[PDB]
Design an enzyme around this catalytic site. Structure first.
Site, short mmCIF file in Angstrom:
data_model
loop_
_atom_site.label_atom_id
_atom_site.label_comp_id
_atom_site.label_asym_id
_atom_site.label_seq_id
_atom_site.Cartn_x
_atom_site.Cartn_y
_atom_site.Cartn_z
N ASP A 69 14.08 31.73 -3.24
CA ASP A 69 13.36 32.41 -4.30
C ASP A 69 14.21 33.50 -4.93
O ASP A 69 15.39 33.30 -5.21
CB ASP A 69 12.06 32.99 -3.76
CG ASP A 69 10.89 32.79 -4.70
OD1 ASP A 69 10.82 33.49 -5.73
OD2 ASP A 69 10.04 31.93 -4.41
N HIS A 108 8.84 38.67 -5.88
CA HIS A 108 8.24 37.36 -5.67
C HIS A 108 8.73 36.72 -4.38
O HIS A 108 7.93 36.24 -3.57
CB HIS A 108 8.54 36.46 -6.87
CG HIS A 108 7.97 35.08 -6.75
ND1 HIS A 108 8.75 33.95 -6.85
CD2 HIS A 108 6.71 34.65 -6.55
CE1 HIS A 108 7.99 32.88 -6.71
NE2 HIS A 108 6.74 33.28 -6.53
N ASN A 127 1.88 25.74 -11.76
CA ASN A 127 0.71 26.43 -12.27
C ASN A 127 0.44 26.05 -13.72
O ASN A 127 0.24 26.92 -14.58
CB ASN A 127 0.90 27.95 -12.14
CG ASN A 127 1.49 28.35 -10.80
OD1 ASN A 127 1.13 27.80 -9.76
ND2 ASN A 127 2.41 29.31 -10.83
N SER A 162 2.76 29.05 -6.03
CA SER A 162 3.86 29.73 -5.36
C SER A 162 3.40 30.53 -4.15
O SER A 162 4.23 30.91 -3.32
CB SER A 162 4.56 30.66 -6.35
OG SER A 162 5.74 31.21 -5.80
#
Ligand code: CA
Length: 279
Positions: free
Chosen positions: A39, A69, A161, A224
């Site tokens: 990530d 994140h 998403n 996520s």
């Protein structure tokens, strides 16, 4: 083991019903397993990681998570309060910059790194990879996820998403890896969560409270956030000897909660991640 007043996410993956706030798990808790967070990096100095997190590779000027994140995804995997496997080892592979974006070539190179860097780590219980990213469809990204899955790593990827079929998104379209959808605390499919026949499992994705950068915490949503739940669950089931890398996604779908989710489109699996822990 039982953690009272835990976030709704971990309590759900340890319950046949919604509305509980106690996470039940075997005390091994992922010890001996490794989860690669691919990530925006992990804040390893966060006290919630207890020295179990570290940055092993960066493709930019710094390995520090300037976004939060990646630190949030690693917290769902194996933080002491918001993690599935509270004893696993977290390896950060920063392929996304501090803006959350990243070129497919860099992200592909990060997957090939994990396929070889796992030979440099001590993971006798298994290796898991949490791919909480994705974009448009690409056979190169899909082949990079299949190569990581074939190398002996459990690859869990986010379905996306977009509220569409995950067949037009990579590495979500790769059939050899674990494509994870999102769900909310009322056992509904998250409105943003992708779907389709390529999906394998759903996880807690809406309002997932985990760690943030700067030693703080916050709650966010997205597939996520459901991917680290399955990623941490795979490492949890690995040290317990229930499954291996090539069969964890198939085992998670077999022992999942069946027919409990609402607003699941036709042809999409109605499976919710469930650790099946009997205290
Ligand atoms: Ca699959």
């Amino acid at each position: 083991a039982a953690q009272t007043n835990a976030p709704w996410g971990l309590a759900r993956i340890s319950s046949t019903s919604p509305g509980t706030s106690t996470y039940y798990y075997d005390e091994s808790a992922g010890q001996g397993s490794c989860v690669y967070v691919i990530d925006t990096g992990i804040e390893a100095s966060h006290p919630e990681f207890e020295g179990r997190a570290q940055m092993v590779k960066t493709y930019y000027y710094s390995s520090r998570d300037g976004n939060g994140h990646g630190t949030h995804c690693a917290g769902t995997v194996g933080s002491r309060t918001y993690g599935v496997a509270k004893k696993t080892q977290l390896f950060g592979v920063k392929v996304l910059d501090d803006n959350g974006s990243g070129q497919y070539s860099t992200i592909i190179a990060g997957m090939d790194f994990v396929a070889s860097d796992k030979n440099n780590r001590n993971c006798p219980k298994g290796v898991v990879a949490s791919l909480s990213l994705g974009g448009g469809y690409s056979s190169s990204v899909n082949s990079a996820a299949a190569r990581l899955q074939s190398s002996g790593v459990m690859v869990a990827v986010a379905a996306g998403n977009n509220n569409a079929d995950a067949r037009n998104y990579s590495p979500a379209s790769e059939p050899s890896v674990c494509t994870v959808g999102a769900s909310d605390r009322y056992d509904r499919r998250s409105s943003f969560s992708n779907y389709g026949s390529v999906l394998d499992i759903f996880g807690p994705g809406t309002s997932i409270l985990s760690t943030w950068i700067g030693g703080s915490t916050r709650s966010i949503s997205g597939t996520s956030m459901a991917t680290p739940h399955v990623a941490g669950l795979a490492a949890y089931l690995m040290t317990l000897g229930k499954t291996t890398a090539a069969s964890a996604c198939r085992y998670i779908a077999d022992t999942a909660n069946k027919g409990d989710l609402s607003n699941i489109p036709f042809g999409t699996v109605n499976l919710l991640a469930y650790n099946n822990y009997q205290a």
